[PDB]
Design a binder for this molecule. Sequence first.
Ligand code: 39I
Length: 343
Amino acid sequence: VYNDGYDDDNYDYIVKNGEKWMDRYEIDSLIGKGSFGQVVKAYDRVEQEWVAIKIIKNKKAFLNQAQIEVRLLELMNKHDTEMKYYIVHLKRHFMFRNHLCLVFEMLSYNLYDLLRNTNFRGVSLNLTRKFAQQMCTALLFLATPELSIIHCDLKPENILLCNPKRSAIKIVDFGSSCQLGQRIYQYIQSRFYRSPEVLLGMPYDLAIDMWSLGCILVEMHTGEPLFSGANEVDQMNKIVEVLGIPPAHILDQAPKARKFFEKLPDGTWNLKKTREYKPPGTRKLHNILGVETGGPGGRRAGESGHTVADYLKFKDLILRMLDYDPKTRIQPYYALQHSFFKK
Ligand SMILES: c1ccc(CNc2nc(Nc3cc(C4CC4)n[nH]3)c3sccc3n2)cc1
């Protein structure tokens, strides 16, 4: 027996469908499993609503890590207040049979689910524009100095949709998140969405999230991840195909520079001859987007909001979000003033 019979050998709560916790939560099913522990779908009898409960493992390590998450979730709750910034907010937390329990809103679809509903051909630049304004709004919120939060894991899997309030998304999972300055790491973000500064072992700040958003916006409208590397070297080759050799002022300061590039005798940087690759900067965004050919594989030809001028506005935005230099990558405030959003 562990935790009086309520826990398994591995510090996790033994989930039984139908259990009433404190005459308030009727548990329906396990819906989630992670290093942190378990997520459950439950009916909150008092608020007459479905909720998702994150049961943290019964272990000092995981409890204090989850208590870091609770700090950020609640700081994100002091600000905001009217739940209007596309963040899946913490409704509350309680201790039940020696497990920390975070209660969240239940949402049953992520961005992925919406791209399988398109057989991965993607969505109108009109819908992309809507989500983009939602995501950018969220990153603007996260960049409030008091917050200065880095999500560190933006990906379609972590972007949930409000079916009820159709054409609305929310960012989820702040368990991998950290605050500006907290202390640099080295292997963060989902590979496909991983910033060049992180690939290069350099320091990072809120801009890594804007990078990940650039790659998600393209993947929303093409149906296809922009940069699907099978390891870090392939990932950085796939980036260079599109954006060229990173500038010198960046590579000259990058610990992992030589894991991908080689400094020639004249001081100029180049790639390394070990799957061969387009030469640098020749898989153009202008073409992937189909800017002059009615969108990716010219599918939205004619359709309102898919004019050349629309795509010149979109490409300019993406390319500003995919800047190699995190000092000059577009920040969410100027990103919201972009013409791609304007009348
Ligand atoms: C385990 C389970 C869930 C997560 C967050 N990912 C997630 N959450 C969902 N639902 C969910 C989570 C939440 C908050 C508990 C975090 N509300 N609703 C859904 S519905 C379809 C895919 C999907 N992916 C992370 C680990």
